[PDB]
Amino acid sequence: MELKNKKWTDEEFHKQREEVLQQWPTGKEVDLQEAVDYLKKIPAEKNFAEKLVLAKKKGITMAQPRAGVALLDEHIELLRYLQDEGGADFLPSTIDAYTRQNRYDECENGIKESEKAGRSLLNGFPGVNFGVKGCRKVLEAVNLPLQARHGTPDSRLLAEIIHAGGWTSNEGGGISYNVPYAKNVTIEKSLLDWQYCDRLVGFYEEQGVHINREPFGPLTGTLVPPSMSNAVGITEALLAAEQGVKNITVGYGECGNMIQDIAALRCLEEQTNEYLKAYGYNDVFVTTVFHQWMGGFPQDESKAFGVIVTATTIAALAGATKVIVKTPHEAIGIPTKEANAAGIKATKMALNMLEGQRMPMSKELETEMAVIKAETKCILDKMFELGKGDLAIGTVKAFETGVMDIPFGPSKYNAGKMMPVRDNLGCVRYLEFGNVPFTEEIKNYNRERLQERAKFEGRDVSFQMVIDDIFAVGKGRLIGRPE
Amino acid sequence: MELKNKKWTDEEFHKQREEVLQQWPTGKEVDLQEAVDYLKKIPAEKNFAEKLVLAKKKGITMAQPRAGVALLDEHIELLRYLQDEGGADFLPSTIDAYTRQNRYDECENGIKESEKAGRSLLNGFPGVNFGVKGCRKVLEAVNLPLQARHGTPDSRLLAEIIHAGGWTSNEGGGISYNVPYAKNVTIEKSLLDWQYCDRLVGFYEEQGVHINREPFGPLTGTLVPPSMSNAVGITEALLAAEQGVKNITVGYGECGNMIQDIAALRCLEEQTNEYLKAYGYNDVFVTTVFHQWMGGFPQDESKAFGVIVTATTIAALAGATKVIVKTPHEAIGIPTKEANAAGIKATKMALNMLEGQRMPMSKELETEMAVIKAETKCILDKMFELGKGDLAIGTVKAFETGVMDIPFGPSKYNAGKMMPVRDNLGCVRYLEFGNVPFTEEIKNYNRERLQERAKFEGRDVSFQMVIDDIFAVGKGRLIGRPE
Amino acid sequence: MEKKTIVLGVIGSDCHAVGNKILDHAFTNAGFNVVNIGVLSPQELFIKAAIETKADAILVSSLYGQGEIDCKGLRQKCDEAGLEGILLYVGGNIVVGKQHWPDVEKRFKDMGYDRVYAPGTPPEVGIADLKKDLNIE
Amino acid sequence: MEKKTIVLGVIGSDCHAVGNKILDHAFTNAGFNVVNIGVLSPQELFIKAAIETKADAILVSSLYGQGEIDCKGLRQKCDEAGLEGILLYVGGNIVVGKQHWPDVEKRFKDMGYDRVYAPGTPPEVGIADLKKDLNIE
């Protein structure tokens, strides 16, 4: 197929579906007519899109963990624990990494081996191998809405199965589930395959079924400047809205400076709404998700709680609709159900300790929001230019030219030129701009903020500081000060 | 002695000293001339007043636990763990409650029972029974400044011993170490006895020896309105300065609304400085201490970390010089060294995750600061009036007339008329004013905030809400919502 | 249920007062005549009040940790004062630190306490136990 | 240090890349010729690079959890490719979840790995181990 930012016709979509469903025998379990009736019989309490509307309505932040294991019964026992002992508001199903490369063969051996070993040898739940039947078993066994959380360039079959499975949210996008996760997939192909995922949701909405989509904000989780992250989220939102998506949670990963982070999430929400309406999408319900620190964690569990709960405080004061929970096991391995419940209990406590509290406006916040909106518009403006008004084509060309550039992304289609680093108050800034199309004014502000760190630390800003910042939180602090 | 807010003369003070030192045989270990030379040989790193100056200058918040056990060697092992494994910035020695009532007989019994049981049967360190000798062994075994933390109406001997012991800070005040801790002690006598404690520090400062004093901000730790709390601390700071104290840390206990708490800490600091200068004390170095939640804790340890670290975030953004650490064992019992170190590590991680970050000015913070300063001034103005310019006599009459009134104070000299409760955003307000001398405009603002909670909850504002607010954190949230 | 009288206070050198006020309020609400002797109360004040008022029970609160010392000997003294068989309850945070609860409960029963309560016990539990023990439930 | 060659990468369906960049830089700064095949690398690419470059060692990083599956059989293949005796290191977060380290180390050594590293290993440790194993320290 040719890439263009235009809604797929029903005939085109259908021809693709018939191909996609043949990619594994469980595709035979997907019946769209049957799936709509199933989905419509799910209670509102278990519908992700509808619960998000409620959250928004009540001004509350809801908490959601990461979690998944190879075997169905075990996976279900884990989610129930998170729900009941943890108090989660939303449930995930974190998909294993073989699935994410469409290696269902490896998934199958992984399941057998996990069975034999009495423990999960997979780092998530193989949803495609378990089919619609298993995904439904999961949903029927819990009392909260369910969402696939993963990192899959070609997610078309997984999406068919988990939605027919009654999971009413799918995370990801054509940029965010490529560049941080793949080395050899073109931006064009992942945009096309995520158009399918958005268009399926579009189908379901057409039938009156509400299903959420969440672009993956944090990307590589490693010092991503808010303007670059937000440009990606806004783009994926627009490209989803074109295929008929009506309920969207845009996301952001904590950088650590409270004001910077609050600015980032407000800018994301505001400009997402602004762009949607400027391009004629006037019936999209937008929510926000704040992810707790996605970089390296300290191994000490008490220190980990320090990260978890400070991150939660930022989320709450930011007015985030959703916060993604980290655990005291983060530095070591996939958490036990008890360690995950811990993380969720600590998070929910903090949220309840801050009920209704929001950061008020200040000159400080105002200035950082102007900065982020200006940077972000530079990037989006250039994208629309390169695509001659088509944001899909503009996205491809933007990565080709380094206009869009994601720190540390393993994709060969990512330029890898832009370099981030923190300033003297821990705000993430641009150290090296590469081809990111900023004005000199915008470049001058980043330099000015960074010079302050240089002066305080008595050393020139450099890649060594970047290295220092990569290890800082794991070593006990936000900013990589020398020593 | 007659009570007046005037510096005791040298002769005056000496005659009291010779009486006080006779109250237990360890008083014979105190030699003022010898102690000055001992104190002056302590390194700056182990002097509490000097490190506080350092913290101020560097714009950092320092962390300090509560800790104490009956036997000398065990107590030293404990403090060494907090320092080394915990990473404390300052060390306490929490004095046991028999000591606090001057029952050195019961302390004696408590030590023998602790020896026999292999565990502490005392809830703190009996510094008077351990003497100068014991107190110096503690100080020589650690590498951080040492402070007596307690709750003692007549602390005169204790002060002589711990200071001669090389402990370079003493917590307390004539109000704050009476009303929350005693039933039958007059305000006049505790004020008189704390004049001694302040005048001893004044002696030491006149010899070139720097020693910190810390009025106990949180009082009963149970819904204390910022303006009542701050009037006490400002008062104790002034009464200390009159006896020659030059290094003072005023304190405040977390109420839980971040903007309210930061307003309170700033108003406290600003008005302490202002009042000091208005009354001619021009060489007093003022710092601040923020205590993490002093009310009932949740038993779940993960939830407890949620309280500990949200409270730390507030302290850090408030610019507090010091923060007192709570532990995941708070709802249950005095923490083991491990649980204490856990609380310290979480706290310090949070602080380092927020290095140099401060809450910026907003209209909201502006307004709350204005309210707190005006409430506080109502109380202080009336106190000076009742005392015909003497704040010490004004303090006695104010407690007699209910002008100063501390919620839940066990003292029979406390009116117990004023009633606090949270508003709909969690700010502690005045429900019942008693004889607190507010203007109609100030009472009307309190009523207006509280009516919004009644409207939201669909119930009249009442003592039942106060009860609910008392239990809410231990049940998982800040505000006592119905159900 | 019935208008029985209890003595209520906080023992030894303990100044903790908030729980005492809640307990008073709840037991009063439950129908009891609460003789509240308050904080920093030695054993003798609990017994004096109990005699003066012909109390059916003495509820000893201990939060500050030194209750293992402070609570020893109350039964004996009640007996010597002619209060043989009176109900003796103790709750709060009665020992220093987190301990193995069954071991603690045994320890205070061995001192002569009729019922022994763990940290965070809701007043409603003690009210129900007392109505039972007094046959007024 | 004397100039030796190593192969470095991240095995299987694992995309974690930051650790790989740090290891590259550090080992390079230590004086090694680092042949970095990057992320999402199957066993065969590790072997192909080792042969092409006559590598002295193969450093397998595995962070995403599935290393217990991905790492098995590597020694076998190296042997069959004629790389008998080559040094095999494995590190990162090589198993799913927090586990008893001695059990994990033996498992991977039983798979044929020369050295096996726990979560959070400093590059500096592996650098030191490698000079020692290569007799150039």
Ligand code: COB
């Ligand atoms: C410098 C570098 C910084 N550290 C990092 O960069 C990793 C930090 C972090 C938070 C992990 C937790 C944490 N450490 O706190 C977590 N990820 Co990530 C959530 N992740 C991401 C980030 C990566 C972006 C990228 N492309 O690079 C993503 C958000 C995309 C991400 C995605 C995943 N992640 C996943 C998982 C499971 C994990 N992820 C981990 C690694 C961790 C430990 C988190 C957890 N706990 O649950 C998981 C592995 C668990 C386990 N082994 O049991 C998963 C499935 C999503 C999920 N369930 O959470 C998904 C899978 C993607 C995949 N296909 O592989 C990140 C950033 C992390 O250190 P490093 O540890 O990588 O390497 C370092 C290195 C350099 O200093 O030396 C050491 N070393 C490493 N290898 C070797 C050696 C040393 C020697 C001597 C050797 C021979 C080898 C040492 O280990």
Ligand code: COB
């Ligand atoms: C409603 C009420 C709210 N709870 C409270 O009001 C107590 C909360 C809190 C934080 C304690 C921790 C926590 N719970 O999280 C802590 N205090 Co205070 C730091 N404290 C204070 C506060 C009191 C002000 C006042 N005058 O009332 C101060 C800051 C002054 C304070 C002072 C002290 N405190 C001290 C200590 C040690 C303790 N304090 C505790 C009680 C605790 C558990 C904290 C800790 N953990 O270390 C300590 C006891 C440890 C232990 N037993 O091992 C100490 C020495 C300072 C320090 N080292 O931390 C000092 C001593 C003063 C003294 N002379 O006693 C407070 C507020 C607390 O509940 P409650 O638990 O009191 O009672 C409640 C009640 C009503 O709902 O029913 C139950 N109940 C109680 N008794 C009985 C029953 C039920 C039945 C059926 C009975 C027969 C009896 C149940 O227990």
